[PDB]
Every structure is written in structure tokens, then in C-alpha cells.
């Protein structure tokens, strides 16, 4: 029902670490400022995604016990979660309140990014579904930590070690859902269900990127490592 002093400590620590990210306004101001070509949008995305991976690795190393994990499992958790964490952060940003008509222009600008419309449709449906859950900053932060510390990733040698680190975060999130959303008792389950939908962005991620209407698909060395691109 109520958070323990240790849980409040864990929550505030995750929040502090999560807030080191670029502010939503910094991202939306760039997109809303002017209409960019498909070529300019591709480079905006690679710069944003490169910054996201850097901030993600810093957030990940601060997660309690992450530094005690086997080094190869550490890489597996990062590569396994990077795309999902990016889309969860994009969903958070998309759902931030902006002046009247700005969210319509933001949506239209994203649809004009330069990628195939078959990749745009599930993106907006996921963003819309995240939006209806009216998640707090603490829920987005804990869910991001839970996504990173998923023991059910490919090439993980010691799944129990990861499971041990994920369990306290799941416990805090469940309590928060019971506190914040007491009228909706399926809220915690609702949030964990979203994580299964997040995983769908994985398989066709490289394809979505190579579909960008640009002459050259140049990615930064960091993006080549974390994503399945050359």
C-alpha cells in the first residue's frame, strides 16, 4: 500500500538520474520551429538518438547493482533495451502538454519525417495508448529502469542476477499505481502490458531507418554499435 523509507529513497534516486535527460521542450521546439526536409530530419534523429544512448548508459550504470553484473550481460541489457527506451522516452515527450494546436503540428511534422507510413501508424498508436494511461514522471522513470533490467533478453547468461535487480523497481511501481491510480486497479498491469508492445519496435527498427527517404543512411559509430546498422 504505502512506500517504505528504502523505497522512497530508491524512487527519488531513480528520478534524479532520469532527469539528466534532454528536456522535452528542447526536442519539441526543434521539430515545431520549422519544417525540415527528409535529409535534415534523418540527421536530427541520429543526433537525438546518439545523445539518448549516451544519457541511457549513464542512467543504466546508476541503477542499483548494475555495475555488479557480468560485463557481457551488461552489454546484452543495453543493446536489448536501447530502442525500447528511446520509444518510451519519445512517447513521454509526445504526450507532454503544449499550446493549443502545437500537438497537431508535432504529429504532422513526425508523419513528414521521411520514413514509410507503415512505420508511422504503430508509433502513433503506441504513443496514444501510453497517453491514455496519464503516466507520471515517476512511472516513466521506473518503467524505463524495468525495461533496462529485463532478465528475459537474448544472450543473458545469469537471468536470476538481473531478476534480483528488477524486482525492487517492480515493487515500487506497483505501490505507485495503487497510490496514484486507486480507481483503476489494472493500472500496474496496464503499464507492464505496454512493455510487450514496446518490444515490437525492435525487430523492424533497422528496416524503418533504411526506409528513410534520403540518399545516404549515415549513422554515428555509437549508433552502429547499439543498433543493427552499418
Amino acid at each position: 500500500m504505502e512506500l517504505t523509507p528504502d523505497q522512497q529513497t530508491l524512487l527519488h534516486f531513480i528520478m534524479d538520474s532520469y532527469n539528466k535527460q534532454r528536456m522535452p521542450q528542447e526536442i519539441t521546439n526543434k521539430i515545431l520551429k520549422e519544417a525540415f526536409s527528409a535529409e535534415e530530419n534523418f540527421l536530427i534523429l541520429t543526433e537525438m538518438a546518439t545523445n539518448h544512448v549516451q544519457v541511457l548508459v549513464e542512467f543504466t550504470k546508476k541503477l542499483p547493482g548494475f555495475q555488479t553484473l557480468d560485463h557481457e550481460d551488461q552489454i546484452a541489457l543495453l543493446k536489448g533495451s536501447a530502442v525500447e527506451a528511446m520509444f518510451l522516452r519519445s512517447a513521454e515527450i509526445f504526450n507532454k502538454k503544449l499550446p493549443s494546436g502545437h500537438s497537431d503540428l508535432l504529429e504532422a511534422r513526425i508523419r513528414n519525417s521521411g520514413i514509410s507510413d507503415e512505420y508511422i501508424t504503430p508509433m502513433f498508436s503506441f504513443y496514444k495508448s501510453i497517453g491514455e494511461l496519464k503516466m507520471t514522471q515517476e512511472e516513466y522513470a521506473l518503467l524505463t529502469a524495468i525495461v533496462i533490467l529485463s532478465p528475459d533478453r537474448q544472450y543473458i547468461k545469469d537471468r536470476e542476477a538481473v531478476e534480483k535487480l528488477q524486482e525492487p523497481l517492480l515493487d515500487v511501481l506497483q505501490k505507485l499505481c495503487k497510490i496514484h491510480q486507486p480507481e483503476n486497479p489494472q493500472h500496474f498491469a496496464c503499464l507492464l502490458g505496454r512493455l510487450t508492445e514496446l518490444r515490437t519496435f525492435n525487430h523492424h527498427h533497422a528496416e524503418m531507418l533504411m526506409s528513410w527517404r534520403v540518399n545516404d543512411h549515415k549513422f554515428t559509430p555509437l549508433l552502429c554499435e547499439i543498433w543493427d546498422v552499418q
Partner: peptide, 12 residues
């Protein structure tokens, strides 16, 4: 081989 991720994880 993923030396950039390995670098960012092992730095500091």
C-alpha cells in the same frame, strides 16, 4: 565487437 558501449560502461 562493441568497444564504444564497453568504454562508456567502464569509464570513471
Amino acid at each position: 565487437d562493441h568497444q564504444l558501449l564497453r568504454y562508456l560502461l567502464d569509464k570513471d
